[PDB]
Amino acid sequence: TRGANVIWFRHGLRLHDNPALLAALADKDQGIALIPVFIFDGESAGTKNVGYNRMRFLLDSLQDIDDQLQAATDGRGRLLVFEGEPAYIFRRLHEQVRLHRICIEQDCEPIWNERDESIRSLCRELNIDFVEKVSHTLWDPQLVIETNGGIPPLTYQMFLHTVQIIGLPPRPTADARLEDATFVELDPEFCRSLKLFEQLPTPEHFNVYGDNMGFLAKINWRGGETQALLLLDERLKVEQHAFERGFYLPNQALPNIHDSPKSMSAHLRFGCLSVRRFYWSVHDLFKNVQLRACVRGVQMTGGAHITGQLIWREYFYTMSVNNPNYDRMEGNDICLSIPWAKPNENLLQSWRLGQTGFPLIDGAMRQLLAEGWLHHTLRNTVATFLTRGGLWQSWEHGLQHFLKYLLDADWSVCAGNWMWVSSSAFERLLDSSLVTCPVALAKRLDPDGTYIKQYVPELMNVPKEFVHEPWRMSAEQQEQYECLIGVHYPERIIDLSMAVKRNMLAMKSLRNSLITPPPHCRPSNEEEVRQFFWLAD
C-alpha cells in the first residue's frame, strides 16, 4: 500500500534484542508494513550441510517466531517462509509491495559475504535501503581486529586483553512493539509462484531423514526463542542460589554427561537467545559483589566463570571474519601446517559411526548422530582421538562431520575448536595422558558405564569391571556376557600406545624444525589447557 519493510531472518531468530527488527519497525508511524521473512536458500542458517536434528531445531525456531508474531498481533502477523534464491524472491516481492528497507542481523563469517552482497547490489539497483545490524556477537568483530593492529587475536588471553581495551559489550536493545505494526496480504499467485510455504515444512520436505543409525534418542531438544528464554531463566535461577550461597556445590562443578537438554549452545548459534542479554543478565546478577570461590579454576566474581564462556565463542567468531580459508589447513594463515596422514576412508567411517572399539569414543559418536549434542569434554576426547592423540587424520574431516550433525555447529566456532585442540603443537601438555586416554577419561566421567551402555547398547550385558575395556574379557567371559570382540563389538581400529608415541614424535620433530612458531591459533598457556579440558589438576 504505502510500502513495507522486510526483516529477514537467517540467524538472529528472535524477537528480543533484535536491532534489525526495531529498525524494520522504525516506520510504523508512517503506515509502513512489516514483512517477517525466512528463505531456505540451500545455505542460510546452516542448511547446506545439515542433518535431521539441526534441521528439526531450525524449524522449531521458525515456528516459535511465527507463533510469537501471531500472539502479539491477534493473528495478523505471520512469518513468511520461502524456498529459493533471495535476490530473485526479493526483486519480485518488491514488485508486489514496495520495499523501503531490508534489515538483517549481520552474518559476520566470510561464508555469508557472497549471499549478502547479492542483496546489497540488488538494494542499490532498486533503491531499497539495506540495513545491517551487529547483534549475533558481543562486539563488532572488526572493532576487535582494528584494535589488535589489523589481525584477529590468536589466543584467548590476547582476545581478553583487546576487549578490555575496548570495554564492556553493548546492552541488549528494547523489545519490539508488534501490537500496532501492520502486515501485508500478498496475491495468492505470487505466493505459489515464489514458493512461499503455506505451513512450515518438515525435514523430509528437503530430503533430510534419520541419521547414520537413527533411534538411540534418550533426550530431545526444543529449538526456538521461547525455550531459549526458559533455559536462561533456569540457568540464572541456579546461578542466583550459587551467588547467594557464595559458591558452587562440588557436583554442580563436575562434568555431567548424564544430564541436560539444558545447554543453550544451539540457541546461541541460531540466535533464539541473544548473546548480549545472556551476558548482561549474568553481569547484573553478580554486579558489585566480591566473592572468593571459583569454578573449575575460574573466579566467580562478576560471573566471569560464565561470561567467560561467551568470550570463547566471540574469540573464534572474530578470528574467522576475514579468512575465507578458516575451515581448512592449506592456505589458512592462522593454522599450523601439520603433516596429517592422508584421508583414510575406513578409519574415518569407523570414527563417524562410533565403531572404533573404544567404548567412550563410540558412545559419544553415536550420541552425536542420535541427539546432535555432546558435552564439551566428549567433543574434546573424540577430536583428539581423531587427530593428534589417535588416528592422526586431519581435523578437517572432523569439522566436516560435526558441521552436519551438531545442533549448534557454528562454522567459525567449530573450526576454531578443531584447530585449537588438534594443531597446537607447542602445547606439550595437550599430548599428555590426561587428555589422550579415552579409557582413563571414561572411568572419570562414567564409572558405572551407564552412559556407555546407553549409546553402545551391545555392551549392555557387560559388567562394570569390563565395560570400559571390554577387550580385557577372556573368551569365556566374552561368550557369557554375549559380546565377542570382532563380531558384536568391533576391535580397536588402532593400537593407541603406538599411535600416540608415533604422534607425539611428529609433534616434537615438528617444533624443532620451525624453532620459532608463526603466529597461529593456540592455547594462551598451560593453565588455559587445564581449564579447557576440564583437567582435575
Ligand SMILES: Cc1cc2nc3c(=O)[nH]c(=O)nc-3n(C[C@H](O)[C@H](O)[C@H](O)COP(=O)(O)OP(=O)(O)OC[C@H]3O[C@@H](n4cnc5c(N)ncnc54)[C@H](O)[C@@H]3O)c2cc1C
Ligand atoms: C571439537 C569441538 C567443536 C566444537 N564446536 C562447537 C560448535 O560448533 N558450536 C558451539 O557453540 N560450541 C562448540 N564447541 C564448544 C563447546 O564444547 C560448546 O559450546 C559447549 O559444549 C556447550 O555446552 P554449554 O552451553 O553447556 O557450554 P557452557 O559452558 O554452558 O557455555 C555457554 C556458551 O558459551 C559458549 N562456549 C562455551 N565453550 C565454548 C568454546 N570452547 N568455544 C566457543 N564457545 C564456547 C557456547 O556458546 C556455550 O553455549 C566445540 C568444542 C570442541 C572441542
Ligand SMILES: [Mg+2]
Ligand atoms: Mg548453555
